Paper text:
GmaR forms an intermolecular complex with MogR and prevents MogR from binding to operator DNA, resulting in the derepression of flagellar transcription. GmaR is a four-domain protein that consists of glycosyltransferase, TPR, linker and antirepressor domains.
To visualize the GmaR–MogR interaction that is required for derepression of flagellar expression, a GmaR–MogR complex structure was determined by X-ray crystallography using the MogRD protein and an N-terminally truncated GmaR protein (GmaR231-637) that contains residues 231–637. In the GmaR–MogR complex, one polypeptide chain of GmaR interacts with one MogR chain, consistent with the 1:1 molar ratio observed by native PAGE and gel-filtration chromatography. The asymmetric unit of the GmaR–MogR crystal contains three copies of the 1:1 complex, which exhibit similar quaternary structures. The hydrophobic side chains of the MogR I155 and F156 residues at the protrusion of the C-terminal coil structure are embedded into the hydrophobic cavity of GmaR. In the overlaid GmaR–MogR and MogR–dsDNA structures, site 1-adjacent GmaR residues substantially clash with dsDNA atoms at the MIG site, suggesting that the site 1 interaction limits the accessibility of dsDNA to the MIG site of MogR via a spatial restraint.
Numbering used by the authors:
A (entry chain B): 5 to 17, 25 to 136, 152 to 161
B (entry chain A): 233 to 636
Write the structure that this text describes.
Amino acid sequence: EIRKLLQEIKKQVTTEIKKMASEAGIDEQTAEEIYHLLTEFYQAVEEHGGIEKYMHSNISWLKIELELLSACYQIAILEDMKVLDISEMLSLNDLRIFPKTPSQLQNTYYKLKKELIQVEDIPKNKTNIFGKVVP
Amino acid sequence: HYIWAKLSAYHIAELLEQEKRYDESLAIIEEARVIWPNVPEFPLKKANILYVNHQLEDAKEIYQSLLENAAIDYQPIVLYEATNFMPHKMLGTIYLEEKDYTRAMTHFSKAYAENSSDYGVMFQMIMLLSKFHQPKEIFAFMERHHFISSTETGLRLLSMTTQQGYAELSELIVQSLTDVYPPVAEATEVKIATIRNVFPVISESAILFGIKEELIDAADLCLWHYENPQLPIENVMKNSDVGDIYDFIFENGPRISKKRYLFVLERAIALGKGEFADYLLALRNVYHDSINSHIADLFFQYDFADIALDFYNIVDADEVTKQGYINLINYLVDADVLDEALAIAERGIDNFSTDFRFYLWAIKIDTENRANRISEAMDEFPNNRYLAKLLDEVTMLQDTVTNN
């Protein structure tokens, strides 16, 4: 139900989207927030060059990308959807909403929820083995 | 949906894997798994690349999926054993490494049923039977399952058992062979007798044939010459393009490659030739002080851990090898020294940042930070499913008790 909705949102990236969520029992505002966050991210992906270019840049995550991830998990979790299912669904293996793997989505959601990272741009970054002294 | 493309992509995936460009190779596979999901040769390669890269649980998942998958109707395109023999052979190899001897025998047996001529599974089953059973019982097994299909097959088996030190099994094997050329039999009898610490007497022709038939190598000749100086080993060794090994070990000659020195030492350790091995160890001074790290690994490999420890204790940590870390981590964990073990596992992550085993050791050891240790591993291995399954276990249990 929610998985089918998120697909149609990604396709656009206006009025029609709110109607799709309401039919499937999804809050129009929360759906509206996702559409703005996705379009801002996809525009932001082009603001950093190309999708392939962004993936090879030293920037691992975007604040807008991180905003969109936490937004997507929240709305999907309210539908009794498992974390791993959301990870695969939003990843490259399914809806290709994020240029990330399921392991990457679930790990970063874990990092966000356990406050291991803030919602900012994230970059990609005579002695023994025992320690005693060998005479 | 054309077979030339599927095979073209495979030539590429295989070419990259052979050049050890595994990440590029796995990229080709994952692309193939999307376009041609029925071709099992692609998943079978992911499993093999994952195996050598020490992600055994992810490899197990794929091999298990290759046998009897309900979701995909795997139809091979060139390797028709991709869904039969090869998954069994690898699952048996992994389960052996995992010390699940019962599961290893089950798959090894099945793999042998599929292809009965693979010296790989036979060598492994024979060694696995050595864990429990006696040589006469093992030979009964091999005869029962028709291991020795021909004389050449038995000799190829014999080169394996003689190097492992299986004196009685080798004796059973060679005696069951029919009409063996006498030089071949003499070389085998001498090799079996050397395992038994019997004075070695071998004819010049038997040595010469034994080298050519790849039943005798330079280590064998050096051991024999050390045990019996009356043997004509120098003339044979000089002509065999290994004269330097003879000169170094016996004639105070110049240094040989570290690989060759350790070759002779390994055979000595493997055959239980303690007198010869000590003598060889006396020659290590001419090598760099780093040579002791390799000797340490050698001793650890053959389960002389106390002797291996004594070498590791005197090696600069900069020169301790990646296997050495893995040996040391395993040793300390068995000695209930988790603090020092974790320190080495952590060290492995810093030096060998791409080796899956070190991150896994930290996860196993650092129980207090397990969830964090798992997350760190995923950062380095973003396509590994085992890590993702591990985090969900901890994450679901925490999130259920905390939220309710």
